Amino acid sequence: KLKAPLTGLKTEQKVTERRPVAVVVNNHPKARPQSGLSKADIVIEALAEGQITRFLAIFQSQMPETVGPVRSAREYFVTLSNGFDSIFVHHGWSPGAKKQLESGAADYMNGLDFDGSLFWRADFSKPPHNSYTSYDYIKKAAEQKGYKLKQETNPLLFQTNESYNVRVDYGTNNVTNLVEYNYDKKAEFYTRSSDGVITTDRETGKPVAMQNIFIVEASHHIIDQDGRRDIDLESGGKGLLFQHGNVIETDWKQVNGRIVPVKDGKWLPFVPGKTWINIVPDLDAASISK
């Protein structure tokens, strides 16, 4: 029947009203492999702690069992979550993020408040990379805060040979953080790996697969005395779009809280399926390959 808003794939009527759930997911080496990333429609990676990146996994067409490890919230993540007015799930936060959310920026769930009940601690890992929750517990937390679980969200724009792969380097002089996306002509999708290991979902033991790689160049600026940096996600800018082994040079503008790829005065559509967005402070961090 109808299609899912964030994937463009057909689904059942009930999902059509399932409110998006955006979870901040730990991407520190010790947090891999994470749980539930294969069920996310959109996953956004961006620099968080030092040279370490962090994810915002947005679920809508598919809800995960357990998801995590959960990590601290950042302003740019609150902003990204809001592009879909999603229930914001996290654990801890930066000063800016705190005031933002305490100012009513979004319906949130802080691991701080449920650590011990709706949020649990994994025993095969140590803090603070052992913090998880589940869609079932997330619902229970919504039932207490009076958060609406059903709402319709405006869908993304989807469409109806060659083969280029891409790598993204976040690391610096001494620290390394390499992400690679390899297209599978046969499978007709991309595979991911970080620091040399293929990105899998601990919950399935299977590699995650997406149909769009969207590299976005956004200004990273320090706005803290400790050095914390923010990411200008409103000024628009340039980026790269990889789909079907193809590569497309593009720009991007923010349209209603969403980062929209636009080229020659028009929105570029996405291929139905999962999408992975990589925010980088320099489009130079990316490198394609045949």
Side-chain angles (χ1 to χ4, degrees), residues 120-145:
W120 73 86
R121 258 48 161 66
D123 71 334
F124 68 78
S125 274
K126 301 178 63 177
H129 306 302
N130 72 327
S131 173
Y132 300 78
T133 183
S134 69
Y135 179 48
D136 193 72
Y137 287 177
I138 296 164
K139 280 143 68 172
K140 293 312 177 183
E143 289 168 55
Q144 307 184 190
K145 265 73 179 62

Short mmCIF file of all heavy atoms in Angstrom, two decimals, residues 120-145:
data_model
loop_
_atom_site.label_atom_id
_atom_site.label_comp_id
_atom_site.label_asym_id
_atom_site.label_seq_id
_atom_site.Cartn_x
_atom_site.Cartn_y
_atom_site.Cartn_z
N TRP A 120 19.16 0.72 30.48
CA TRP A 120 19.89 -0.30 31.23
C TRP A 120 21.38 -0.28 30.92
O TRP A 120 21.82 0.37 29.96
CB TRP A 120 19.30 -1.69 30.98
CG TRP A 120 19.58 -2.28 29.62
CD1 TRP A 120 20.69 -2.99 29.24
CD2 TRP A 120 18.69 -2.31 28.50
NE1 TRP A 120 20.54 -3.47 27.96
CE2 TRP A 120 19.32 -3.06 27.48
CE3 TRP A 120 17.43 -1.76 28.26
CZ2 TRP A 120 18.71 -3.29 26.25
CZ3 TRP A 120 16.83 -1.98 27.04
CH2 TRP A 120 17.48 -2.74 26.04
N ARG A 121 22.14 -0.98 31.75
CA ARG A 121 23.60 -1.07 31.62
C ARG A 121 24.03 -2.47 31.18
O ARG A 121 23.76 -3.46 31.86
CB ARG A 121 24.27 -0.74 32.95
CG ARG A 121 24.87 0.67 33.08
CD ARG A 121 23.90 1.72 32.63
NE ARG A 121 24.18 3.07 33.11
CZ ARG A 121 25.23 3.81 32.77
NH1 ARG A 121 26.16 3.35 31.94
NH2 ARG A 121 25.33 5.05 33.24
N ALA A 122 24.70 -2.56 30.04
CA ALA A 122 25.18 -3.83 29.53
C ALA A 122 26.36 -4.33 30.37
O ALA A 122 27.23 -3.55 30.76
CB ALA A 122 25.58 -3.67 28.08
N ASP A 123 26.40 -5.64 30.63
CA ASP A 123 27.47 -6.23 31.43
C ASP A 123 28.68 -6.72 30.64
O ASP A 123 29.68 -7.12 31.22
CB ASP A 123 26.92 -7.41 32.24
CG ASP A 123 26.60 -8.59 31.37
OD1 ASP A 123 26.33 -8.39 30.16
OD2 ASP A 123 26.60 -9.72 31.88
N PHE A 124 28.59 -6.70 29.31
CA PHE A 124 29.72 -7.14 28.49
C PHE A 124 30.57 -5.92 28.13
O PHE A 124 31.57 -6.03 27.42
CB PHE A 124 29.22 -7.83 27.22
CG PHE A 124 28.54 -6.90 26.26
CD1 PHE A 124 29.28 -6.06 25.44
CD2 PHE A 124 27.15 -6.82 26.22
CE1 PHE A 124 28.66 -5.14 24.61
CE2 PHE A 124 26.51 -5.90 25.39
CZ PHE A 124 27.27 -5.06 24.58
N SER A 125 30.14 -4.75 28.62
CA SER A 125 30.83 -3.49 28.38
C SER A 125 30.85 -2.62 29.63
O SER A 125 30.05 -2.81 30.54
CB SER A 125 30.15 -2.73 27.24
OG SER A 125 30.66 -3.17 26.00
N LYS A 126 31.76 -1.65 29.66
CA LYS A 126 31.92 -0.77 30.80
C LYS A 126 31.43 0.65 30.52
O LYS A 126 31.37 1.06 29.37
CB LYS A 126 33.39 -0.73 31.22
CG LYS A 126 33.96 -2.09 31.59
CD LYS A 126 35.44 -2.00 31.94
CE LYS A 126 35.67 -1.14 33.17
NZ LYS A 126 37.12 -1.12 33.54
N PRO A 127 31.09 1.41 31.57
CA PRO A 127 30.62 2.78 31.33
C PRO A 127 31.73 3.57 30.67
O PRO A 127 32.91 3.31 30.90
CB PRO A 127 30.31 3.29 32.75
CG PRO A 127 29.96 2.07 33.49
CD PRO A 127 31.00 1.07 33.00
N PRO A 128 31.38 4.57 29.85
CA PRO A 128 30.01 4.97 29.52
C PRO A 128 29.59 4.52 28.13
O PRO A 128 28.92 5.25 27.42
CB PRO A 128 30.07 6.48 29.64
CG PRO A 128 31.41 6.78 29.03
CD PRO A 128 32.32 5.68 29.59
N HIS A 129 30.01 3.31 27.75
CA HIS A 129 29.70 2.74 26.44
C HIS A 129 28.80 1.52 26.63
O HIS A 129 28.67 0.68 25.73
CB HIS A 129 31.00 2.31 25.74
CG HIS A 129 32.03 3.39 25.63
ND1 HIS A 129 31.79 4.59 25.01
CD2 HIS A 129 33.31 3.45 26.08
CE1 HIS A 129 32.87 5.35 25.08
NE2 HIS A 129 33.80 4.68 25.73
N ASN A 130 28.18 1.42 27.79
CA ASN A 130 27.32 0.27 28.08
C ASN A 130 25.86 0.65 28.35
O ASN A 130 25.11 -0.14 28.90
CB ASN A 130 27.90 -0.50 29.27
CG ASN A 130 27.73 0.24 30.60
OD1 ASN A 130 27.76 1.48 30.66
ND2 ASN A 130 27.56 -0.52 31.67
N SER A 131 25.47 1.84 27.91
CA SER A 131 24.11 2.33 28.13
C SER A 131 23.12 2.13 26.97
O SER A 131 23.28 2.71 25.89
CB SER A 131 24.20 3.82 28.49
OG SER A 131 22.92 4.40 28.57
N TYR A 132 22.11 1.29 27.19
CA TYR A 132 21.10 1.00 26.18
C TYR A 132 19.66 1.19 26.65
O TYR A 132 19.38 1.33 27.84
CB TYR A 132 21.19 -0.46 25.72
CG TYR A 132 22.50 -0.88 25.12
CD1 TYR A 132 23.60 -1.16 25.92
CD2 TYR A 132 22.64 -0.99 23.74
CE1 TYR A 132 24.82 -1.53 25.37
CE2 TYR A 132 23.85 -1.36 23.16
CZ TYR A 132 24.94 -1.63 23.98
OH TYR A 132 26.14 -1.97 23.42
N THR A 133 18.75 1.19 25.67
CA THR A 133 17.32 1.25 25.92
C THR A 133 16.68 0.44 24.80
O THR A 133 17.39 -0.22 24.04
CB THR A 133 16.74 2.67 25.91
OG1 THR A 133 15.35 2.60 26.24
CG2 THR A 133 16.88 3.31 24.54
N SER A 134 15.35 0.49 24.69
CA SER A 134 14.64 -0.25 23.66
C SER A 134 13.41 0.52 23.24
O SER A 134 12.96 1.40 23.97
CB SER A 134 14.21 -1.62 24.21
OG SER A 134 13.20 -1.48 25.20
N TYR A 135 12.86 0.21 22.07
CA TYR A 135 11.67 0.91 21.62
C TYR A 135 10.54 0.71 22.63
O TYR A 135 9.76 1.62 22.89
CB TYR A 135 11.22 0.42 20.24
CG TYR A 135 9.97 1.14 19.75
CD1 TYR A 135 9.88 2.52 19.81
CD2 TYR A 135 8.88 0.43 19.23
CE1 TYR A 135 8.75 3.20 19.37
CE2 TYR A 135 7.73 1.10 18.77
CZ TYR A 135 7.69 2.49 18.85
OH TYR A 135 6.59 3.20 18.39
N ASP A 136 10.46 -0.48 23.20
CA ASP A 136 9.42 -0.77 24.19
C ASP A 136 9.59 0.15 25.40
O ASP A 136 8.62 0.71 25.90
CB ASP A 136 9.50 -2.23 24.64
CG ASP A 136 8.27 -2.66 25.42
OD1 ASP A 136 7.19 -2.82 24.80
OD2 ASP A 136 8.37 -2.83 26.65
N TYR A 137 10.83 0.32 25.87
CA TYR A 137 11.07 1.20 27.02
C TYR A 137 10.90 2.66 26.63
O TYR A 137 10.49 3.49 27.44
CB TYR A 137 12.49 0.97 27.58
CG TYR A 137 12.64 -0.34 28.32
CD1 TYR A 137 13.88 -0.72 28.83
CD2 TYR A 137 11.55 -1.18 28.54
CE1 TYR A 137 14.02 -1.90 29.55
CE2 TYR A 137 11.67 -2.36 29.26
CZ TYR A 137 12.91 -2.72 29.77
OH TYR A 137 13.05 -3.89 30.49
N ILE A 138 11.24 2.97 25.39
CA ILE A 138 11.10 4.34 24.92
C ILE A 138 9.62 4.71 24.90
O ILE A 138 9.25 5.84 25.22
CB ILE A 138 11.69 4.47 23.51
CG1 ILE A 138 13.20 4.19 23.59
CG2 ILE A 138 11.39 5.85 22.93
CD1 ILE A 138 13.86 3.90 22.24
N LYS A 139 8.78 3.76 24.53
CA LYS A 139 7.34 3.99 24.52
C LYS A 139 6.86 4.24 25.95
O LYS A 139 6.11 5.18 26.21
CB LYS A 139 6.62 2.79 23.91
CG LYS A 139 6.66 2.76 22.40
CD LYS A 139 6.80 1.34 21.86
CE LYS A 139 5.59 0.48 22.10
NZ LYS A 139 5.74 -0.82 21.37
N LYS A 140 7.33 3.40 26.87
CA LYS A 140 6.94 3.55 28.27
C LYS A 140 7.33 4.92 28.81
O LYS A 140 6.58 5.52 29.58
CB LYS A 140 7.57 2.44 29.12
CG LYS A 140 7.03 1.05 28.82
CD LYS A 140 5.50 1.03 28.77
CE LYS A 140 4.95 -0.35 28.40
NZ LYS A 140 3.45 -0.40 28.27
N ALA A 141 8.47 5.44 28.38
CA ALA A 141 8.92 6.75 28.83
C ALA A 141 8.05 7.84 28.20
O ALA A 141 7.89 8.92 28.77
CB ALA A 141 10.39 6.97 28.48
N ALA A 142 7.50 7.55 27.03
CA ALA A 142 6.63 8.50 26.34
C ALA A 142 5.29 8.52 27.08
O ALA A 142 4.67 9.57 27.22
CB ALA A 142 6.43 8.09 24.89
N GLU A 143 4.86 7.35 27.54
CA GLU A 143 3.60 7.22 28.26
C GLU A 143 3.60 7.98 29.59
O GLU A 143 2.54 8.35 30.09
CB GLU A 143 3.30 5.73 28.51
CG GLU A 143 2.90 4.98 27.26
CD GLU A 143 2.89 3.47 27.44
OE1 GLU A 143 2.20 2.96 28.36
OE2 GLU A 143 3.57 2.77 26.65
N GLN A 144 4.79 8.22 30.15
CA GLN A 144 4.89 8.94 31.42
C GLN A 144 4.98 10.45 31.22
O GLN A 144 4.46 11.21 32.02
CB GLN A 144 6.13 8.52 32.20
CG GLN A 144 6.30 7.04 32.44
CD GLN A 144 7.51 6.75 33.30
OE1 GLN A 144 7.93 5.60 33.45
NE2 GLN A 144 8.08 7.81 33.89
N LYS A 145 5.67 10.87 30.16
CA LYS A 145 5.83 12.29 29.87
C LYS A 145 4.70 12.84 29.02
O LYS A 145 4.69 14.02 28.68
CB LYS A 145 7.16 12.54 29.15
CG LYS A 145 8.31 12.95 30.06
CD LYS A 145 8.83 11.78 30.88
CE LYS A 145 10.00 12.21 31.76
NZ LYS A 145 9.62 13.25 32.75
#
